[PDB]
Symmetry: D2
């Protein structure tokens, strides 16, 4: 029987690449999405065409709220209902936008940024553990200690996610569930970012003066879920081409 993985925010960009690469490795996949329904269903079609009965979708808002615990239970449930098991959880989904200290209300910003980046990962981890080569991989940020100007809530969420990776590694080790992170620097640049700013970020990266492909990020996720990482838990692997080493 093939193992099964849940990947949050898997319809596009890095989540999509992780889902595809896990599928190619032999996993059956739950494609979670929020708004990108067409992309999600298109991915499931592609993967099922490759191997029958190996991909499904699950929609959920991962903003923090009174119903989030139930929403996270249902995402994990969807893996069990379709595939009868859940071996891997990849916390990839993420809100990312500025929240200056000095449109959306501040309480909504808190809910979205801390919800997607930290609280949802915690609730999904809870549900994943309770329902049991098991492992969880959290998508972190290599630049968390040199944060983007005016992104305090996003940065707080990513710091919180490091805490979860370590706390969960410690607590779930007795159950044989490993918990690790992968920390991109710059990978697929945000859709809205202008071409001039995109070029400025590329020119800062020591290794090749370009961004990581989504596949290069997925390669690190594949390593951490594999048998070659069976003693690795609580580790966060930077995949940033030396960007975080570069001073102001």
């Amino acid at each position: 029987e093939a193992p099964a993985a849940v990947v949050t925010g898997a319809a596009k960009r890095i989540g999509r690449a992780i889902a595809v690469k896990l599928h190619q490795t032999g996993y059956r996949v739950v494609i979670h999405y929020h708004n990108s329904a067409e992309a999600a269903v298109s991915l499931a079609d592609e993967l099922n065409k490759e191997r029958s009965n190996t991909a499904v979708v699950c929609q959920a808002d991962l903003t923090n709220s009174n119903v989030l615990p139930a929403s996270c239970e249902e995402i994990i449930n969807s893996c069990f209902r379709a595939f009868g098991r859940c071996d891997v959880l990849v916390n990839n989904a993420s809100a990312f936008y500025p929240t200056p200290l000095v449109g959306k209300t501040v309480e909504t910003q808190v809910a979205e940024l801390i919800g997607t980046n930290a609280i949802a990962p915690f609730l999904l981890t809870m549900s994943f553990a309770q329902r049991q080569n098991l492992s969880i991989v959290n998508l972190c940020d290599a630049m968390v200690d040199q944060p983007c100007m005016a992104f305090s809530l996003y940065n707080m969420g990513k710091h919180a996610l490091v805490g979860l990776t370590q706390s969960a590694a410690l607590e779930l080790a007795p159950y044989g569930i490993r918990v690790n992170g992968v920390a991109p620097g710059v990978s697929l640049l945000p859709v809205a970012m202008g071409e001039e700013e995109k070029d400025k970020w590329r020119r800062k990266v020591p290794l090749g003066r370009r961004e990581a492909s989504a596949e290069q990020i997925a390669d690190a996720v594949i390593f951490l879920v594999s048998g070659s990482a069976q003693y690795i838990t609580g580790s966060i692997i930077k995949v940033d081409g030396g960007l975080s080493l570069v001073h102001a």
Copy 2:
């Protein structure tokens, strides 16, 4: 005119010590509290007896909710109402209890632990800056954030988020001349719930003296960070832990 400080969770223990030492240095203080009304009022009485009209109390629940931004704005408002200015914010209030992964609901646990330790400090920082000398903010962190207590995931997540706020806020508020720093205890005043046997277990782990930090020793680090001797220090988190975080399992 004397400067003014807000200290959250100041009715007892480390918060009280910070409030007292700030007062003794020359600050007027807002003593924020949640449930400890009698203690807060008693402290304000003691400080006002030393110097008239230099201490007030301010009640607020810092659990996460849609009104938390309003509550945080109001704590800063209260400092301006009493003293006409607000120079120092100390984020000390904290919920602390285990939340195992495997009669509070998980929603409540998230709201209290992430609210008190991270979101409230963020909203108080927003309101503090929005209203703006020697201005600074001090966040009470945790020296053991990378070697966390078993089954304290949400608390640990909160304190990690607080490190992020400290760095992010230091970067962003530097242009306004507001410094943002942290003080990170190891073991200080042990919980009142904890039994004496278990307290001794923790004391025995500390390289420097085999004892916990007094509240005053923690307050000493806060006073340094707010002082003129720390004018170029921002984004720094000073451990005050007697070497505890250096000890392997």
Copy 3:
């Protein structure tokens, strides 16, 4: 043509497993050693029996001295002499013993700082100057911020090795040379260490209550030298079973 690797301290234990795993992956290997001549020759014999003309030995003392730079240049030379190329350097050799603050101290400094830091630096210099998929892997220590009592000089050396890893990753990026680290917690325990003390350490590891095999450490080295880690540089991967996360 097969690529070539230098592994320092490769006669025994973790170094041996790295050399063997690199060889199985297809590398030709220089097996460096200091005192373990018989074990080093035996390894080279076994690898050459598998694939003729794919292994040689190279003896060198890596204690700090005024001739250490020449010794390190000669190790890199030996790879080129044998195989006409040098693609991978693994800095594994290490002196490990206590040096209480309260053998001469000159010797202790020369051995502990030389093997763990200065020799890696000089080998990195020689490797770079002689220059695809080029990279360097440094054997670090996951417990570097929770040090063993009375091991100041060892700890200083391993801290220095982190600094080298980061500094060299930055400077050598424009030459396409990646520089990374693998940081064991407890793996193969010291030969001198008593059985009660070994059991004490094993019981502290969250993930399985046992030390890592030398093979589990080699697995992370292999990941870092591979095409799956092409955007990874300046990264140190802990392989410690969660040991570094455990408070006193």
Copy 4:
């Protein structure tokens, strides 16, 4: 009776400001220097004019060598000769120049850079501890994880110094000796640096767009040796105006 402090590299710049503030606080001081004899003697003259026989000078090369242990012993010896006691050690003296990976020989660069920044502090720590509000303060570097291009040996030394700070804090705690660090970002910029290049660094600092005065660095040292830091050991306080927080 008044306490006594040894400050290495105390003739000029940051070391001088530290010696002055320690003296103003009530300490008697050993002013250590290497080449700057005129400045050292003139500083002692100034302090002795304030309070009779409260300052002495002590010359020593802190480059790594066979005689360095003896030399460090004699620096501590000189404090006891002059003042009958040694309460505080400040490791401030430092070599700082580039050492690219691709007329000094490399062995000499190793000796100077690793000697001044790491090995000498270690030997002075040994001698200080052996001879016993006692504390040691090590001058570190806030930018140690975002290092200057082509400064590998300097960076390795400063990393090693973090290792010493932590290892010695642990080991010397039972004797009541605290061991901490102060980590400037940019303070007094090097004399050899051109004013255009100095201006570029100043413009990078979030808090005030300028470098730290030597006195601001001295302020953190005074805090760490005071009674207001009695429970603080193994801590490194950045004094960098937010510089280490700024991405590339």
